[PDB]
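Newbie here. three chains, one complex. Structure please?
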Amino acid sequence: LDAQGRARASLCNLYNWRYKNLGNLPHVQLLPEFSTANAGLLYDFQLINVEDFQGVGESEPNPYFYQNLGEAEYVVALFMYMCLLGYPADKISILTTYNGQKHLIRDIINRRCGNNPLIGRPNKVTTVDRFQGQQNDYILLSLVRTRAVGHLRDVRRLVVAMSRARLGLYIFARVSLFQNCFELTPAFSQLTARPLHLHIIPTEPFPTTRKNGERPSHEVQIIKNMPQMANFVYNMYMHLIQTTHHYHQTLL
Amino acid sequence: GRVTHTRRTFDRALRALPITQHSRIWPLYLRFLRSHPLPETAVRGYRRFLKLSPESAEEYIEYLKSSDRLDEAAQRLATVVNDERFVSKAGKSNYQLWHELCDLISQNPDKVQSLNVDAIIRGGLTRFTDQLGKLWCSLADYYIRSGHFEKARDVYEEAIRTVMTVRDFTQVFDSYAQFEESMIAAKMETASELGREEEDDVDLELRLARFEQLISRRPLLLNSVLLRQNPHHVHEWHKRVALH
Amino acid sequence: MAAPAQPKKIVAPTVSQINAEFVTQLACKYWAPHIKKKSPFDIKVIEDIYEKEIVKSRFAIRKIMLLEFSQYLENYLWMNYSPEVSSKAYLMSICCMVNEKFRENVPAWEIFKKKPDHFPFFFKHILKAALAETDGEFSLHEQTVLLLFLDHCFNSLEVDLIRSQVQQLISLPMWMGLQLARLELELKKTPKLRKFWNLIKKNDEKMDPEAREQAYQERRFLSQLIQKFISVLKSVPLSEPVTMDKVHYCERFIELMIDLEALLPTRRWFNTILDDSHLLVHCYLSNLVRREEDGHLFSQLLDMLKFYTGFEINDQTGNALTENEMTTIHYDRITSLQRAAFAHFPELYDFALSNVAEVDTRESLVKFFGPLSSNTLHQVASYLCLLPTLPKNEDTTFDKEFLLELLVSRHERRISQIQQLNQMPLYPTEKIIWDENIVPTEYYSGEGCLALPKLNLQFLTLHDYLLRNFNLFRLESTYEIRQDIEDSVSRMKPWQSEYGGVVFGGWARMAQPIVAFTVVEVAKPNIGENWPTRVRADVTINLNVRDHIKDEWEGLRKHDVCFLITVRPTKPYGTKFDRRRPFIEQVGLVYVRGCEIQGMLDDKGRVIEDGPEPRPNLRGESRTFRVFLDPNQYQQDMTNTIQNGAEDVYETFNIIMRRKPKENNFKAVLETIRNLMNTDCVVPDWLHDIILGYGDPSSAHYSKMPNQ
């Protein structure tokens, strides 16, 4: 079968190279949902480099219970950023290569987002494998590892991971590790052809009228790392409360 | 003579009515089905009646025998022999039904193929503890018909080893000697017809010498059987030395 | 005695460690993909990597991984390979990278398609290297790498490039390695091959001498390699410390022999050479098998090799041989031997006067042939075309033990695969669950052999296909059973009491202490079975636990699989278990037996029927479950108790463990696979051969089907 109807062609290119003649159905080029950009994000997909937070890369409290606090916090910070722009939380799903990181991501969500009516909870926090058959419009993916590629190196797991997104996929990774992996290279070359720092457009609320790949009318802000992201979203969240409280106080 | 339409009216009568009315239908319909070379239809018809009428399984086995469907007959009768609660119009014992099972089977290694014949008769050897020498000869007979003439000899020596009466021993000895005689004569004839290869002539000389061994072993075996009965039999020990 | 080195978790090297390594600096200078300005190819770099990084590290996995991560094969080796520059260092480096890729289960052969014309020259150098003397240019460890590379090649028959070389080695012309008497016997059995054989000789007469001698080496390659192996195998001492390089060479060789026998296109020609080489007799009498520590994995592989060589298949047609055919072939062997005995050998007349069953057992064969002289035994073997004809005035150069084993193993009655399977317990025991050679741990490095069936593209028969699947499914389930035991018992914390009893200082949701166990019924065997038809036992437990856990234990339905576990802890109260140490040594686990739930018992000892809800509220905290025991294991345990004076395992149980229902289905599945081996697998003829990987794969496609 040679035509997929489910994801954007730019996203389809991340996994089509495993298939002989995988093209796109006509509606993938014609329907607005696939042609409209992701609001407040410069690129429809981006690979975000996450350096070691506090000098810690991956951690392993129990055998095979892999965690990466730096990537996990960055994933939730981008999730919070999207919700404050007006993204529905059921549109966003959070995926990770390991069950250990899934537990860590849930703990951060429960402390920061779980009881917050302005953000809520993501659609799913699960492993990539257990997500098979399912899909969502937006996917946030933590690759976790910083030492070795071996679970991602099985290209079959990569193909599934790339295909979960209909409209946008943002991948948080030690880019320097995975870029050297020969089998990952045909997809990652496309990911690394774009800037490795997260590019956001905070003045563009959801929904946007901008087309995917169109140059934005507003200035692109470049987020260099997770602490800059976390502080920015916190300041924006505090600002949003302040404007809402002033609106309530002026109504009073 | 409308065979096609007669069955259809039976099949519609079965479709139309409860199982009580079926019990009226089936005596005529099974009698009808037997009269034709339509064995698939009669097999399906007979099966239905069995869980109402166990005696009809005798009629079905007799139908399978007359239809030469002996492999199916062996499967049903083996089930019947395990289903020891069975009822017979002749009043046949479960041993006799097992005997009839082995009668059909030992005649027909070619036709009977769905069953582990060896296991069934060895099961019978555990069940029918008094009959053993007869069962060995019937088991050897099956192996003769299988063309495994050596396996027949295997069973007869195995029989001689297991036997613990002179009465059973006589039966095994006489049957084995007749088997030995028949293969010796066959080896004489085939060596003359085919031309004597050196291994073929030696094969005849072996079987004769085995028959020479058999008769000379017979006093020792006879004495040994009494020693199986009573190892304490000091007289038989003296007679054993007297043969030695 | 230093304790054997624990399997150190190979923590794969970090990016900071990778970037600091000398190998990566070489990679960055010469071949790494992300650098636009590479240095030109230098053959000395390959020699430098081989001597300083590969050989000096003793082929250390971590260093090989660094070369693999550096893309050394794809960007430097094969792209610059030519026959004129092929050195030993060049040759061995390529083989190591391929074997590493197979160990990682990533595509190894795709790089060779960029320059296919260099591979036949490359492959021939390997064949010469594989035949190199043991004290010569290539060490046994390097040869072990070559054996593993060759094994990967023989298992890769879907690759036309590889197949084209393999088909030259394994075809009807390879029978020039056979004994002349053996050769003439086989060509007489199959007169069609005698016509082709004379054509082969006539074709060799037309070849040029260089290509003819090269072809003669290739056709004799596997036969010479066996002879080479036997020299190495005989050099294995019985009691002196053996070099592991000898063991790994021997184990990988038998693996290679198994895979050749496990595939029908290879088996069809090699098995006749393999039988004539008497490899199995030489191996079973070898000092290596008699070494319990070093030879255990080798022995398991050898038994697997004995299995495939003897498999119930007609090697020429590929059709499975029926047990009646196997019985007839067996009687043909004995009848030929009794004819030979009674003609030529007066000492054997006492043997020949016996019937077939009197002689055909292994014990009988040793009893009849053992008193004979060595010269007489050789003459019998020569008449059967197993050995050359003994000259009338020379003593045999072969040992009497060799001569005895050759005659016994050729004529011993085989035990049926179905019978072995039916006698085999379905639940794994402690002997198998923690046998790291059969059920490897999570930390298994991939360096050794494994005595495991491989689900290849091709299978010998439908019987073979099912069994390989059966074994792997059982062992996979066994690994889960291991994890379930390790998690549950560690939570229960078994420690030695002051009185030497068991005190449980903790609790597990999935396992409870047994209060009482009693075997209630042992049913008589079926028709044709040597094991009980059914064994029933009762297991009493106390569910003084939280309600949700109590409901889960009372929740257990008929056909649920549970495990009975015996622990006898030797560690004092309060000892913390260390997960990096062996599990059994910490908890004192003695026995593991699986059981199947019939149901929970009421106060009258009757099984509570699984009815539609609500179940009767049973009094207090104590519950009794009636269970089915494995009848094959029970038969073996009682046999072990009576024959060897072992303790009654069924009196010892102190823990029952349940599994999660989604995963606890394995036993019934195993029964189904076993049942499939017991039933004529009538696969449709249009589908049958494709599942086995033979014939035209498109034959079931609609364009070829006649009933389109």
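Moderator note: Chains B and A do not touch (no CB pair under 8 Å). The longest helix of chain B spans residues 198-229. Thread marked as resolved.
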